[PDB]
Amino acid sequence: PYKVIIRPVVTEKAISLIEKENKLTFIVDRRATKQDIKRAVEEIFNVKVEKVNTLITPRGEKKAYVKLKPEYSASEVAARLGLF
Amino acid sequence: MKPSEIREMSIEEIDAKIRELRLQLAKERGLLTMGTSLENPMVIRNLRRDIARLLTIKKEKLREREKGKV
Amino acid sequence: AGKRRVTENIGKGHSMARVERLKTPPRYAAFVPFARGGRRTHPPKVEKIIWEDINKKEKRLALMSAIAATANYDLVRARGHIIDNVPQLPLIVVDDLQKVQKTRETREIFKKLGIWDDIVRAKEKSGVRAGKGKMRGRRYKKAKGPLIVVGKNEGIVLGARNHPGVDVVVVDNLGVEHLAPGTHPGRLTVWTVSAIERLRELYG
Amino acid sequence: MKISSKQPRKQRKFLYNAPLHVRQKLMSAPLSRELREKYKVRNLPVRVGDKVRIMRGDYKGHEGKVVEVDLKRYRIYVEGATLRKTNGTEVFYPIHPSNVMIIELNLEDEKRKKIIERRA
Amino acid sequence: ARNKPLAKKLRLAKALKQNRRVPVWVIVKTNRRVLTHPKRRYWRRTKLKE
RNA sequence: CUAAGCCGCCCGGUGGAUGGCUCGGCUCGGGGCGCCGACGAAGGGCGUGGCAAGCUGCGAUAAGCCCCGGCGAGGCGCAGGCAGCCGUCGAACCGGGGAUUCCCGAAUGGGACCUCCCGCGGCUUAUGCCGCACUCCGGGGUUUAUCCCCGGAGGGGGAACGCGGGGAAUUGAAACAUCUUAGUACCCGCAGGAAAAGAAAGCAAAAGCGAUGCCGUGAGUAGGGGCGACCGAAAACGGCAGAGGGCAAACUGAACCCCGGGCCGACGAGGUUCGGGGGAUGUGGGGUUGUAGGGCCCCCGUAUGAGACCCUCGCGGGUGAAGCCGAAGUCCGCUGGAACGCGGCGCCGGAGAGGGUGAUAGCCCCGUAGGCGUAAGCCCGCAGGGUCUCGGGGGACCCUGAGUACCGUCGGUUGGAUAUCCGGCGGGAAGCUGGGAGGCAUCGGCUCCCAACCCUAAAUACGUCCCGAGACCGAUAGCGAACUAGUACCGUGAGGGAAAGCUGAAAAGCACCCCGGGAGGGGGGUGAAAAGAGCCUGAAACCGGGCGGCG
RNA sequence: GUAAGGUCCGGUGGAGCCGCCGGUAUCGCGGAUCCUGCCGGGAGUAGCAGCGUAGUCGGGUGAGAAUCCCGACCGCCGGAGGGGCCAGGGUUCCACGGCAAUGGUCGUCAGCCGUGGGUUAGUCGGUCCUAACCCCGCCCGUAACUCGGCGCGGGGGAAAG
Structure with a gap:
């Protein structure tokens, strides 16, 4: 769903962040806000988001670290996505 | 996918298929950035053009339905 | 051309030539007849007068002379045409020639008349020329052959159009170039009875 | 199709920049005498399945099936018209369709049959 | 330099992405005809237009 | 048997001339097409390809998406690779119509030291949509605030051409001030595919012509000029093309116009009706002219008839996108890597223009000579339904453009010379029993006209662009750019602005062996020929070796 | 051939070219401190000192080490040649793999080349306020404007206040 x-x-x-801090790293679209990223993650993956941090890389693309709540595992989402 | 089969389905099914194709496109872009065994390098192109077809036919259905209702 | 460049002269003092040069590196010379990329001193101009004029009476006299020479024996042979099989000069043909509109029929008629040899000679002489004309569409330098003059056209031009080096001209529109190609008089010509009558009427 | 200009520059420009649908008609080859008598058509565009006999080149007289067709280069590859690489592999020589004759037509295509009907 | 407007940052990012070598497979495809492009840049020697 | 050195020949290196080639330039009679934008233009920023940097194209549906038609087996740009995919349910490609179309930009709800941000109201469950710039036009409300609501305009761009204003100097006069350069460079404003002009208060006098515009000529003439340098027309005549109409007033007096709705008509034309906004400070009817024209009045007759135009519920035809057909040898011998060549034997020709193809080809392919088809649009016609127009005589009554014509003075401009045109200042009529022009002023005669309001196609100017052509150039030439060119690069800026084409018929682009850290070298293979990619030819300068002469 | 030149013989080259007649032209090269490109003697020469004269010994790496890495010793700055951080630069940042070119010598090294990665905010700064000052609307002037301007209404204006 969505274009975020x-x-x-x-x-x-x-991968280290997924293993340690229950964080998923995404490259999202520039105009998306933190609420947009949180909502997109929650709707797509049926998980609860604890926090969202965003930055813009020197290549002009927006990267988001989404820290999930302790109730849900980021490793499961990575496996579902094939991250391994 | 073909325009005929896309026209066969309804607007809601078109939206659902668009969502699935978007998710799969994101998955395949991630896989492309990760691995090197690109068995089918054209999957991204096919998914993107299918998304375009779905959106175009959805807009066509919306316009024709509005014209018929009015 | 060569006038789009902005230049500033270095001037006296520098151990160089007082030549206009560009204001940006590497500071080449520009806008001079003797500077690379500059304008040409005295180039061709579209306002030049190339049209030449000749008096109508003088042109008529020249056409008269050309028609008189077309019936000569020494000049026609000396031009290059082969006239071994021609019955006589001038070669006058009946009006029937004006109604033929098939190239094979004209070929047979010309074979019987005795000019097919000249047509073949023209075809052989036509060939690829030398120079830059090939770039511009002048690859072949074609030769001339017999000239068909008729008093009225009802298919003869279509019939005899395709033979190498022959022109089919109605007597009314007959010009000096048709009879003296390249300024060389004595072109082998075949006329018609009606064309000869019209020549008699016009006196030339 | 009309190319009316008698200027070599424009002729060659058209030849090189022609669209694909026009280059399609530029890959025609003459038919054999028997095929000409049977179909009343002088020449046709060449497909891959068509049998072919070569006339000009180092492989003149060779017969074989058309392996490849390239509209961009106006070329074709015919079985048996090959070259030996240094390592010892077989490659296909590119042959202009004008140097080819179609001794057998693969006419499974209804549109090709329509073309034959129209030209006959 | 430490504090940058977003538009200027995006322009710098575009220039950075622009600066890279010609692909070897592109060289092979062109048959050694295309080797370099005018937009190559050295940061210390060739400065950005902005 | 002389060391360095000098000249000459050969070979080799360096370099890139010459020669040949050309999908690019330049020029041009004729032909075609000529504006885009608030329904958000042009220019630009940033993104977009599996491997993707430049160019090109596209816009989060991002070298693309959909529908009708043409072509008929390949396709995935410049761009020759790997992998894969799309296509016979008709792809690629082409012509027409649609969808998407980020941000800035007239940029417009408010701001820009960064093409990114912050706002206010209705709808929506919410997602998410619709409104809000300034200067005005036609309406409504009230708060009378130009405050709010509905409808509609202007804004910016366009290579050259066009219209209206402002307006220099170098330079020439062999100095220089009147003059010339010059109503030019350049500046401000305003339109279109053309613009402007255009129908006589004109032109001419033995006669007369009869709107405007353009060309030839009048003509270096009339005429201006420190009468110096120089500047400089019109009429007539011959041509292209042809076309003429509407207001103000006399008179009548709401018989009128626009927006929205209804009804009859065909869905159109037309007719009729309701509400709103205008309108007696005049909507509509009529009327547009010179020894006169028109209103009104009077008299005779006419209209019965004859036009002209509007619409297409309908039909026929022409033209009109992609596009389709279109004759004749791949017949023997020779050279050749390869026949387009040489000799022999043939054929078509309304087609012997031109190009490709392994050489130079009428008959191998495209095509030409000559013909055919085409949706939308446009044009013409048939038929049906409507609207509108049309005669003469007399008058003594009424109307016919005002700070206007014109006079004086000052500045500009002009060949305009006491006799061009425009503008400022101060004066300023007649007005039909009237008025104006006829090259100093006034008087009389004669001739020709009716200003002070408005519109007008075709003949013309231009070429961003498109067909066609060439006694133009052939990579230091031709446009600056034959190519990832107004690209890279230089300057804070305005702005300035390059160099750079060629393997071969086919990559057949050197498999394997020895040496070397590598680069590469020597064998050996490919090719007709290395033409070996640092690739058609390979000059000169210059350098190294051998050879011959001197030393 | 008095000549401007022409023509023949022997090599390379692989595709066009010429005699004669009559016309046309960007039609003939030593200079212009001429223009563009290439190449010479100067020359294997100057420079690689002066303002801070800095290296040496063992070991390692690597085909190759004065120049790269570790230990020791000797030194230099030590009110900056140390530490922190603007504007400007714009990926020069980090790891790994390398030395065709760049580095005043060399190079296994690098601010170089190739391949992958790197910038996480309610509290730090912009964002808010206003200063000098600027812009827009009305208004007046100008032949006119993108030009000049007083007065009103509105908006901006500090990354060290």
Whole structure:
């Protein structure tokens, strides 16, 4: 659903974040706000989001760290997405 | 997908299919960035053009329904 | 051309030539007849007068002379045409020639008359020329052959159009170039009875 | 189709920049005498299945099936007209369709049959 | 430099992405005809237009 | 058997001339097409490809999406690769119509030191949509605030051409001030595919012509000019093209116009009716002219008839996108890597224009000579339904453009010379028993006209663009750009602005062996020829070796 | 051939070219401190000092080490050559793999080349306020404007207040 999410980030730093801090790393569309990213994640993956941080990379794309609540596992979502 | 089969389905099914195609397109872009065994490099293109077809036919159905109702 | 460049002269003092040069690196020379990329000193101009005029009476006299020469023996042979099989000069043909509109029929008629040899000679002489004309569409430099003159056209131009180097001209629109190609008089010509009568009426 | 200009520059410009649907008609080859008598058509565009005999080139007289067709280059590949690579592999020589004759037509296409009907 | 407007940052990002070599497969496809493009840049020597 | 050095020949290196080639330029009689924008233009920013940097194209549906038609087996741009996918349920491609169309930009709800931000109201459950700039026009409300609501305009762009204003100097006069340069460069404003002009208070006098515009000519003439340098027309005549109409007033007096709705008609034309807004400070009817014209009045007759125009519920025809047909050898021998070549034997020709194809080809392919088809649109016609127009004589009554014509003075402009035109200042009529022009002023005669209100096609000017052509150029030439060119680069800025084409018929682009850290070298293969990618030819300068001469 | 030149013989080249007659032209090169491109002697020469003269010994890496890495010793700045952080720069940041070119010598090294990655805010700053000052609307002037301007209404204006 929605156009907020462009692609998951499959970098080693992202994978470490998934393993440790229950965080999923996404590359999303620039005009999206933090509420938009939170709502998109919650609706698409049926998970509860605890926090959202955003930045704009030197390439001009928006990257979002979405920290999920302890009740849901980010590893499960990564496996569902094929992140491994 | 073909325009005929897209026209066969209803607007709600078109929206659902659009959502599924968007999610799959995101998944495949992530997989492309991750791995190197690109068995089907054209999946992204096919999904994107199918999305375009679905949206176009949805707009056509909306316009024709409005014209018929009016 | 060569006048779109902004230049500033270095002037005296520098160990160079007082030549206009560009204001940006590498500061080349520009806008000079002797500077690379500059204008040409005295180039061609579209306002030049190329049309030449000749008096109507003088043109008529020249056409008369050309028609008189077309019936000569020494000049026609000296031009290059082969006239071995021609019955006589001038070669006058009956009005029937004006109603033929098939190239094969005209070929057979010309074979019988004795000019097919000249047509073949023209075809052989036509060939690829030398120079830049090939770029501009002048690859072939075609030769001339017999000239068909008729008093009235009802198919003869279509019939004899395709033979290499032959022109079919109605007597009314007959010009000096038709009879003296390249300024060389003595072109092999075949006339018609009606064309000859019209020549008699006009006196030329 | 009309190319009316008698200027080589425009002729070659049209040849090189022609669209694909026009290049389609630029890949026609003459038919054999028997096929010409049977179909009353002098030439046709060449498909892949058509049998072909070569006239000009180092492979003149060779017969085979049309392997490849390239509209962009106006070329075709015919079975048996091959070259030996240094390593020892077989490649296909590109042959202009004008140097080919169709000794057998693969006419499973109703549109091709329509073309034959129209031209006959 | 430390504080940058978003539009200027995006323009710098576009220039950075622009600056890269010609793909080797593109060179092969063109048969060694296309090797370089005018938009190559060295940060210390060739400065951005902005 | 002389070391360095010099000249000459050969080979090699360096370089890129010459030669040949050309999908690019330049020029041009004729032909076609000529505006885009608040229903958000042009220019630009940023994004968009599986591998993707430049160019090109597209816009979060992002080298694309959908529908009708043409073509008929390949396709996925410049751009020759890997992988894969799309297509016979007709792709690619082409012509027509649609959908999407980020941000800035006239940019417009308010702001820009960054093409990004902050706002206010209805609808919506909410998602998410619809409204809100300034200067005005036609209406409504009230709060009378130009405050609110409905409808509608202007804004910016366009290579050259057009219309209206402001307006220099170098330069020439062999100096320089009147003058010239010049109503030019340039500036401000305003339109279109053309613009402007255009129908006589005109032109001419043995006669007369009869709107405007353009060309030839009048003509370096009349005429202006420190009468110096120089500047400089019109009429007539011959041509292109042809076309003429409406107001103000006399008279009548709401018989009228626009917006929305209804009804009869065909869905159109037309007719009729209701509400609202205008209108007696005049909507509509009539009327547009010179020894006169028109209103009104009077008299005779006419209209019965004859036009002209509007619409297409309907029909026929022409033209009109992609596009389709279109004759004749791949017949023997020779050279050749390969026949388009040479010799022999043939054929078509309304087609011997031009191009490609492994050489130079009428008959191998495209095409030409000549013909055909086409949705929408446009044009013509048939038929039906409507609207509208049309005669002469007399008058003594009424009307016919005001700070206007014109006079004096000052500035500009002009060939306009006491006799061009425009403008300022101060004066300023007649007005039909009237008025104006006829090259100093006034008087009389004669001739020609009726200003001070408005519109007007075709003949013309231009070429961003499109067909066609060439005694133009052939990569230091031709446009600056034959190519990822107004690109890279230089300057804070205004702005300035390059260099750079060619393997071969086919990559057949060197498999394998020895040496080397590598780059690469030597064998060996491909090719007719390395033409070996640092690739058609390979000059000169310059450098190294051998050879011959001197030393 | 008095000549401007022409023509023949022997090589390379692989595709066009010429005699004669009559016309046309950007029609003939040593200079213009001429223009564009290439290449010479100067020359294997100057420079690689002066303002802070800095390296050495063992070991490692690597085909190759004065120049790269570790230990020790000797040194230099030490009111900056140390620490923190603007404007400007714009990926120069980090790891790994490299040395065709760049680095005043060399190079296994790098601010170089190739491949992947890196910037997380209610509290820090912009965002808010206003200062010098600027803009827009009305208004007046100007032949006119994108020009000049007083007075009213509105808006902006500080990354060190």
